[PDB]
Structure 1
Amino acid sequence: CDVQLYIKRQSEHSILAGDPFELECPVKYCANRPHVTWCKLNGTTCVKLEDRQTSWKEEKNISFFILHFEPVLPNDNGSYRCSANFQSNLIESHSTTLYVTD
């Protein structure tokens, strides 16, 4: 079993400023749950999201690592990647784009 992040290339979401939002990193893992982190692209550099509220929602055959927007603000517009650390391995998701309206 390989650890996999199921975010589709060119994935996008349209969301309303002032409404709460849940951005999901769908994780396939078989044994020990990896350490996953969100980051936001500026050009070709993924700034880790350190001060941000995150949670897990576990399902039978996949698990969701959620980045919470409480609430979404206009500055949350942009591209987000999710990353998983298992031992010496680093699994890197496709970026998903948020479009905010206000």
Structure 2
Amino acid sequence: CDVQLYIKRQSEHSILAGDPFELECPVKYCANRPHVTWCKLNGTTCVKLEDRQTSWKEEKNISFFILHFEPVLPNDNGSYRCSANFQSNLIESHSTTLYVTDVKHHHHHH
């Protein structure tokens, strides 16, 4: 089989700071599961993530490498990418863009 990452071009999500949320990077493989990581884009560099962290959920013919936001903070705004090392090669996914609304400082007047 061919390894590949299935994030759609211009993927975006709109979520509330304060709620929990997961991003799911769909990974295709068959033989050995590849080492996957997530990173947030800050311009030129994609800085890797490790503090509030990741996990796998495996489905029939496609698995999901999951970045957990527990809860989502206001500063979690921005673009995110997963990368997969398989047999020395590297697959760079389309980024997905989180638009977090700061519920604390957001007010309905009505």
Write the distance in 1 (CA, Å) between the matches of 2:87 and 2:30.
14
Write the distance in 1 (CA, Å) between the matches of 2:53 and 2:79.
18
Once the two structures are aligned, what percentage of the paired residues are identical? 100
RMSD: 0.8
Write the distance in 2 (CA, Å) between the matches of 1:51 and 1:79.
18
Are residue 95 (structure 1) and residue 85 (structure 2) matched? no
Deviation track 1:41-76 (CA, whole Å, cap 9, x = no partner) reads 011210011223211010001100000001000000
Residues 52, 70 of structure 2: 8 Å contact kept: no
Unpaired runs of 5+ residues, structure 1, are none
Write the distance in 1 (CA, Å) between the matches of 2:19 and 2:33.
30
Give 3-state SS (helix, strand or coil) of 1:40's partner: strand
Give 3-state SS (helix, strand or coil) of 1:38's partner: strand
Q: Which runs of 4+ in 1 moved over 2 A?
A: none
Write the distance in 1 (CA, Å) between the matches of 2:65 and 2:73.
21
Select the structure of larger CA radius of gyration: 2
Unpaired runs of 5+ residues, structure 2, are 103-110
Question: TM-score scaled to structure 2, two decimals?
Answer: 0.90
How many residues are matched?
A: 102
Q: Which residue of 1 aligns with 2:75?
A: 75
Give 3-state SS (helix, strand or coil) of 2:75's partner: helix
**Greater shift after overlay, 44-53 or 64-73?**
44-53
Write the distance in 2 (CA, Å) between the matches of 1:29 and 1:69.
25
Question: TM-score scaled to structure 1, two decimals?
Answer: 0.96
